[PDB]
Design a protein around this ligand. Structure first.
Ligand code: 076
Lengths: 99, 99
């Protein structure tokens, strides 16, 4: 699919057995999802952006489906204001920017 | 061009006649460039990101070249960690996400 940028590029994702909406973000190195009770081990992390840093929990090898495309990788969980799909998963679904 | 996402989508921009590097950022509504002297009138604005809000200078109708493509629109100038081209100017250069 092709997604224009007139509005925030939100798509449905599936993660942890739940459906959420998330932002496809080429400006994010990492994928950051709203607080959710994912199973298993995790490592503390801090990620930053405009505004400063927030504290998140890093989960590895998480299966996520993004707009119907399966992916598997690292997901950070914490108090983000929006669900963000970063480049670590955008590459896996073969996403590009074109102009 | 077509740009893949294995590395940060950094490109050259010209703004105020100066070359800078900036990140093509589909997760950003707005374009935010690091503190600089820029010709044009501005007003104080606040913008938010992953870790809180910063103060910026809002400049409307600024001519900018992004990866060789012209845009004329609002540029926010302030203490962003990385120069970011957001959707307001990505739309002007005709950028889409594709997968
Ligand atoms: C999400 C994180 C992992 C991402 N950061 C990064 O990818 C890299 O972060 C840094 C931080 C400091 C220095 C160098 C690099 C980011 O903020 N990405 C932003 C761009 C950016 C800002 C500052 C530094 C680097 C990138 C931008 O894409 C995301 O904010 C949008 C998403 C959004 C939409 C609405 C409300 C809030 C947040």
């Amino acid at each position: 699919p092709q997604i224009t940028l007139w509005k925030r590029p939100l798509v449905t994702i599936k993660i942890g057995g739940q459906l959420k909406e998330a932002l496809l973000d080429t400006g994010a190195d990492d994928t950051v999802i709203e607080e959710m009770s994912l199973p298993g081990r995790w490592k503390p992390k801090m990620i930053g952006g405009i505004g400063g840093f927030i504290k998140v929990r890093q989960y590895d090898q998480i299966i996520i489906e993004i707009a119907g495309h399966k992916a598997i990788g690292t997901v950070l969980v914490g108090p983000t204001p929006v669900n963000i799909i970063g480049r670590n998963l955008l590459t896996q679904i073969g996403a590009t920017l074109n102009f």
